[PDB]
Amino acid sequence: GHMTTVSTNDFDQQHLWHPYASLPPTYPNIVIDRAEGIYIVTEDGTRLIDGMSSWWASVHGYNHPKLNAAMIEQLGKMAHVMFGGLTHQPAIDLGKKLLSIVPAGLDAIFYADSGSIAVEVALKMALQYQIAAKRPSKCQFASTHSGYYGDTWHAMSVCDPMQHFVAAPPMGFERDLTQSEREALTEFFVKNSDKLAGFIIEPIIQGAGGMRFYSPQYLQLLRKLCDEYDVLLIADEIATGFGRSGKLFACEHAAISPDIMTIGKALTGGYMTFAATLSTREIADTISQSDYPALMHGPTFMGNPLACAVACASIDLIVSYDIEARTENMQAIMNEQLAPAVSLEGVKEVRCLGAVAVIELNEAVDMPIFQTLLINNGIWVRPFGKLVYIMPPYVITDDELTTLCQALLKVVSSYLTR
Amino acid sequence: MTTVSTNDFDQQHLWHPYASLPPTYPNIVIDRAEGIYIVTEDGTRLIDGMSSWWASVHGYNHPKLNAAMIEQLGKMAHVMFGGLTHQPAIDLGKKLLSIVPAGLDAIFYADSGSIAVEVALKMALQYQIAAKRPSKCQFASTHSGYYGDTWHAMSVCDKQLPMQHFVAAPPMGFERDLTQSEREALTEFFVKNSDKLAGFIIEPIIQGAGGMRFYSPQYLQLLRKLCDEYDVLLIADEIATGFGRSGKLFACEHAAISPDIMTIGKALTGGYMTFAATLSTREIADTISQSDYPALMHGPTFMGNPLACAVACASIDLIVSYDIEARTENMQAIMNEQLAPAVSLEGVKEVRCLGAVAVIELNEAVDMPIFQTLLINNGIWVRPFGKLVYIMPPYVITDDELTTLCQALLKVVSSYLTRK
Ligand SMILES: *Cc1c(COP(=O)(O)O)cnc(C)c1O
Ligand SMILES: *Cc1c(COP(=O)(O)O)cnc(C)c1O
């Protein structure tokens, strides 16, 4: 029985763009002062459980002592040094850690400033590879109809220049493919493979594209087709990587390895922008031994040592958790607590996988109404379209997670009153 | 005799910028940095003449940058910018609007310079669509520019990569007057093409990665007038020039013009971390915002990162505390005096200095393996490209440090040319 009204920072409101709002926005942004654990804290002292982990990334929560200490240790040596002609121990130590954990066969690492740049580099690698392999007709990309891979211009092109699309994979993590579905994908490759440098996909969970979960069988078939038809499989694990689907990398659900993989977000525990593009040795060698041996990208802050150092700490934490058990427990609690939402007339369905839960509504969320329910219930959630979803941090306790899910179910129920 | 540290894991597994894997020459392992120096794993200090690619303008391990980082870490390294804001974003924004060219009023924080450029181009396209000039859907630049390595930025850099429009590289020389023929050609380009152009993008005064070229403020003044008269947005990429590099805080100041859109980065954070911003006029922000597509269609996950904002506040406060014009005029004077004798060397074409940039342009491309073997023993780190041996030292460098750097550089260049 409440509505909470936040106070507008006039400077923000007039002068600063934010990702999904006009300038000025119709409704002001909430000023956050600090954060700790699973909580963000408003300028007035109100603590809110961040159910979003700051868009998938803050998987250890906020103000983590180990992450902070790792950042500070590196700071005392150097925040940054250029990577042209120079290297450093954080880059080396991170690289060794990554090669020890990522899907087998990935052997070369291109550090990037952001996920979208990692994707741009993945696409460039694939193009240069095919040119080096003397298959210059293989100059386009394919994806499924429901994907998302970043907001830079090349990434935009395979998000739902011209590219090629197949059906969105069928919804349902436990659903078996049909013969018709298998044949259609196969037919797509028979028809188009000579034009395709690569097929790019988010493995298992398609995020910004609709929070869709699909079968590992789809990925298994895709891997086999890419093998037989000489198309590189590019797995965008920027959102899924480091545990989110219930395995360390979502590719593991299918027990496949991609030719190229992008990672980011949870890589640094959400502390700072950073990403990487990994490839096989075959790709790195083929390019490197070609007429164009240099990979034609190089961000100014490539390899940033501070990002590398926090990433080492973040990976060590993930490995320490028993990430499969942790996320299995998260899934079980979110499913139990949120399943009763289906009782509500304006709810379509509820679906949980690993450390992701989605309450899909029948109609688009009216954001101000929903949010004016947020503060009074002690939580922060950011819907998109018809989706009210959470991606909580792996450090969340059972009691904290229960509090978050009970609060969310109260918010959704109260919202569906208006 | 110096033995530097190298690393077999790096050599086999880590890509470096625009490099093969493995590279033909190994990377030097850096352990730490302090002041103007980088320090190898074996303890060898090298003056970094590059400021880590234009950005480390206060040097390394600066106590005020470090303090800003530590202070923000105690509060939060990061929080999402969707529906939320924070004081570092606000305070940085206020600082920026106080110093940037007049008319810039709206700020889009970005993860990197390349993304800032991508966002600038998108703003310009959305603006023309909102203004009901949807034919204005292409971009122009000069030959010899550089604006980042992402796919849209690549297209304005000198079927699947989109076509754009180019004019001649501006004439070399900061003090050079334009000719009537040069004025007419540029004008003719606008008469011909302006109905197709959403914007004209350029690095003001100094064109960096494209050739370390200096050109006249008269050129930028003419371009601003043409863009005004022909309804083409002027996009000034100040990612490298911003915060003092050309001898003014922003290189646009040489021409006493303001762009419609400006990108900044690099020195913005004192080179501590990747971060950038795209600024526009109110007219652009409003016109989009009041259109059928009111939302600017970009949003990196780490947009507005508070840690980056907090170190950028500290970096700007430092720049404002310097007399940036006097500091860079003194740097120019020293670099010119110390490096001018290079022109007497067979295989040097010319030497040019402007503000805190010095370029020794050679007749032939630098043979990098040879060049590398002279660095360590002379106590400096410089990274040539093409035919160019250039430095962009930090604003904190002392007269004696800068003298040491330039005398060492002249010794390296001289020994390189006779070996080549
Ligand atoms: C977030 C995301 C990206 C983009 O990373 P940014 O850091 O926003 O540039 C790319 N791909 C996927 C799957 C992501 O979730
Ligand atoms: C460095 C630079 C960029 C690119 O910034 P990144 O951080 O490498 O993406 C864009 N424009 C200019 C003028 C620059 O110097």
Q: Tokens in use for A406?
A: 């009970």
Which of B173, B170, B162, B171 lies closest to B198 in space, CA to CA?
Answer: B162
Q: In terms of C-beta distances under 8 Å and separation of at least 24 residues, what long-range contacts does A189-194 make, across chains too?
A: A189/A225, A189/A226, A189/A228, A189/A229, A189/A231, A190/A229, A192/A142, A192/A164, A193/A229, A193/A230, A193/A231, A194/A135, A194/A137, A194/A138
Instruction: Give me the resolution in angstroms, 1 decimal.
Output: 1.6
Which CATH code of 2.60.40.420, 3.30.390.50, 3.90.550.10, 3.90.1150.10 fits the domain covering A1-63+322-418?
3.90.1150.10
Question: Which DSSP state fits B312?
Answer: H
End-to-end CA separation in angstroms for chain A: 12
With residues binned 3-state (H G I as helix, E B as strand, rest as coil), the percentages for chain A, rounded to 5, are 40, 20, 40
Tokens 């930025």 sit at which residue?
A: B153
In angstroms, the Cα distances linking A197 to A137, A283, A404 are 8, 12, 44
B395 labelled catalytic: no
Whole-number Å distance, alpha carbon B145 to ligand 1 midpoint, is: 28
How far is it, in rounded angstroms, from Cα A359 to Cα A339?
A: 9
Å between B264 CA and nearest CA of chain A: 13
Q: In terms of C-beta distances under 8 Å and separation of at least 24 residues, what long-range contacts does A141-145 make, across chains too?
A: A141/A196, A141/A197, A141/A198, A141/A199, A141/A200, A142/A166, A142/A188, A142/A192, A142/A196, A142/A198, A142/A199, A142/A200, A142/A231, A143/A199, A143/A200, A143/A201, A144/A168, A144/A169, A144/A201, A144/A206
DSSP B317-335: HHHHHS-HHHHHHHHHHHH
Q: Tokens in use for A220?
A: 């298994």
Is the CB of residue A300 less than 8 Å from the CB of residue A142? no
B212 phi-psi bin (left φ>0, alpha ψ -120 to 50, beta other): left
Is the CB of residue B401 less than 8 Å from the CB of residue B51? no
Determine the Cα angle at A368 with ends A366 and A370, to 5°.
65
Which amino acid is present at B406? C
How far is it, in rounded angstroms, from Cα A272 to Cα A80?
A: 13
How far is it, in rounded angstroms, from Cα A389 to Cα A52?
A: 8
Nearest-10 Cα torsion for A22, A24, A28, A32: 90
How far is it, in rounded angstroms, from Cα B201 to Cα B193?
A: 14
Cα Rg of chain A, angstroms: 22
Q: Backbone phi, then psi, for A173, in 5-degree steps?
A: -60, -35
How far is it, in rounded angstroms, from Cα B44 to Cα B81?
A: 42
Number of H helices, E strands in chain B: 13, 17
3-state secondary structure of B195: helix
Q: Cβ contacts of residue B189 below 8 Å, gap of 6+?
A: B140, B165, B167
In angstroms, the Cα distances linking B2 to A224, B78, B377 are 52, 42, 7
How far is it, in rounded angstroms, from Cα A391 to Cα A53?
A: 6
Is the CB of residue B116 less than 8 Å from the CB of residue B308? no
The secondary structure element, H or E, covering residue B118 is: helix B113-130
State the angle between helix axes of B368-375 and B399-419 in degrees (0 to 180), rounded to the nearest 10: 140
Is the CB of residue B26 less than 8 Å from the CB of residue A121? no
Is the CB of residue A290 less than 8 Å from the CB of residue A128? yes
Q: In terms of C-beta distances under 8 Å and separation of at least 24 residues, what long-range contacts does A96-103 make, across chains too?
A: A96/B9, A97/A312, A97/A315, A97/A316, A98/A263, A98/A276, A98/A278, A98/A315, A99/B13, A101/A248, A101/A249, A101/A315, A101/A319, A102/A249, A102/A261, A102/A263, A102/A278, A103/A249, A103/A251, A103/A252, A103/A256, A103/A257, A103/A258, A103/A261
Which amino acid is present at A346? G
CA A29 to chain CA mean position, Å: 24
3-state secondary structure of A182: helix
3-state secondary structure of B255: coil
CA B39 to chain CA mean position, Å: 24
Tokens 């121990």 sit at which residue?
A: A89
How far is it, in rounded angstroms, from Cα A220 to Cα A224?
A: 6
The secondary structure element, H or E, covering residue A408 is: helix A398-415
- Residue B292's CB is within 10 A of a number of other CB atoms, namely 6
Q: Tokens in use for A372?
A: 């004016």
3-state secondary structure of B174: coil
CA A30 to chain CA mean position, Å: 24
Closest ligand to residue A202's CA = 1
B393 phi-psi bin (left φ>0, alpha ψ -120 to 50, beta other): beta
Is the CB of residue B193 less than 8 Å from the CB of residue B204? no
Determine the Cα angle at A16 with ends A12 and A22, to 5°.
105
Tokens 């007219």 sit at which residue?
A: B283
Bridge partners, A50 (sequence order): A380
- Residue B320's CB is within 10 A of a number of other CB atoms, namely 14
User: Counting Cβ atoms within 10 Å, is residue A65 exposed (0-12), middle (13-18) or buried (19+)?
Assistant: exposed
Length of chain A (residues): 418
Per-residue b/e over A347-379, b at no fewer than 16 CB within 10 Å? bbebbbbbbbbbbbbeeebebeebbbbbbbbbb
Q: Backbone phi, then psi, for A365, in 5-degree steps?
A: -75, 130
3-state secondary structure of B155: helix
Per-residue b/e over B74-89, b at no fewer than 16 CB within 10 Å? ebbbbbbbbbbbbbbb
CA B294 to chain CA mean position, Å: 30
Half-sphere exposure of A329 (CA within 13 A, CB side): 16
Whole-number Å distance, alpha carbon A85 to ligand 2 midpoint, is: 18
Q: Backbone phi, then psi, for B93, in 5-degree steps?
A: -60, -45
Cα Rg of chain B, angstroms: 22
How far is it, in rounded angstroms, from Cα B235 to Cα B121?
A: 8
Which of B141, B311, B305 lies closest to B227 in space, CA to CA?
Answer: B141
Which of B168, B325, B183, B358 lies closest to B253 in space, CA to CA?
Answer: B325
Which of B107, B81, B111, B83 lies closest to B96 in space, CA to CA?
Answer: B107
B211 phi-psi bin (left φ>0, alpha ψ -120 to 50, beta other): left
Is the CB of residue B226 less than 8 Å from the CB of residue B187? yes
Per-residue b/e over B22-56, b at no fewer than 16 CB within 10 Å? bbeebbbbbbbbebbbbbbbeebbbbbbbbbbbbb
User: Counting Cβ atoms within 10 Å, is residue A328 exposed (0-12), middle (13-18) or buried (19+)?
Assistant: middle
CA A198 to chain CA mean position, Å: 20
In angstroms, the Cα distances linking A345 to A212, A341, A342, A389 are 22, 9, 8, 18
Q: Backbone phi, then psi, for A145, in 5-degree steps?
A: -55, -20
In angstroms, the Cα distances linking A270 to A68, A348, B15, B48, B76 are 12, 31, 23, 31, 11
Whole-number Å distance, alpha carbon A150 to ligand 1 midpoint, is: 5
Choice from B114, B203, B235, B302 to test ligand 2 binding pocket (greatest atom count within 8 A of CB): B114
B279 phi-psi bin (left φ>0, alpha ψ -120 to 50, beta other): beta
Is the CB of residue A327 less than 8 Å from the CB of residue A401? no
Q: Tokens in use for A231?
A: 């198309």
User: Counting Cβ atoms within 10 Å, is residue B279 exposed (0-12), middle (13-18) or buried (19+)?
Assistant: buried
**Cβ of A299 and B274 within 8 Å?**
yes
How far is it, in rounded angstroms, from Cα B325 to Cα B158?
A: 31
Q: Tokens in use for B116?
A: 């800032």
Å between A169 CA and nearest CA of chain B: 25
**Cβ of A19 and B75 within 8 Å?**
no
Closest ligand to residue B153's CA = 2
Q: For domain A64-321, give the CATH number.
A: 3.40.640.10
How far is it, in rounded angstroms, from Cα B266 to Cα A80?
A: 12
Check if CATH label 3.40.640.10 holds for domain B62-322. yes
B266 labelled catalytic: yes
Is the CB of residue A113 less than 8 Å from the CB of residue A301? yes
Which of A172, A170, A210, A214 lies closest to A385 in space, CA to CA?
Answer: A210
- Strands A106-112 and A275-280, bridge-based pairing: antiparallel
Determine the Cα angle at B127 with ends A55 and B156, to 5°.
80
Q: Backbone phi, then psi, for A301, in 5-degree steps?
A: -95, 20
How far is it, in rounded angstroms, from Cα A301 to Cα A303?
A: 6
Bridge partners, A109 (sequence order): A278, B14
How many contacts, defined by CB atoms under 8 Å, are there between A and B? 341
B146 labelled catalytic: yes
Cα four-point dihedral sign A214, A220, A226, A232: positive
**Test mutation, B25, B65, B85, chain A, max A CBs within 10 A:** B85
Question: Which DSSP state fits B274?
Answer: -
Domain boundaries, chain A: 1-63+322-418, 64-321
Closest ligand to residue B149's CA = 2
Q: Given A20, A176, A291, A399, which residue is catalytic?
A: A20
How far is it, in rounded angstroms, from Cα B300 to Cα A118?
A: 13
Is the CB of residue A199 less than 8 Å from the CB of residue A166? no
End-to-end CA separation in angstroms for chain B: 21
Q: Given A50, A236, A259, A271, which residue is catalytic?
A: A236
Which CATH code of 1.10.3720.10, 3.30.1380.10, 3.40.50.300, 3.90.1150.10 fits the domain covering B1-61+323-420?
3.90.1150.10
Ligand 1: residues whose CB is within 6 Å?
A 114-116, 119, 148-150, 202, 207, 236, 238-239, 264-265; B 300-302
Which of B245, B278, B243 lies closest to B259 in space, CA to CA?
Answer: B278
How far is it, in rounded angstroms, from Cα B174 to Cα B354?
A: 8
Determine the Cα angle at B38 with ends B36 and B44, to 5°.
120
The secondary structure element, H or E, covering residue B235 is: strand B233-237
How far is it, in rounded angstroms, from Cα B365 to Cα B387?
A: 4
Is the CB of residue B114 less than 8 Å from the CB of residue B175? no
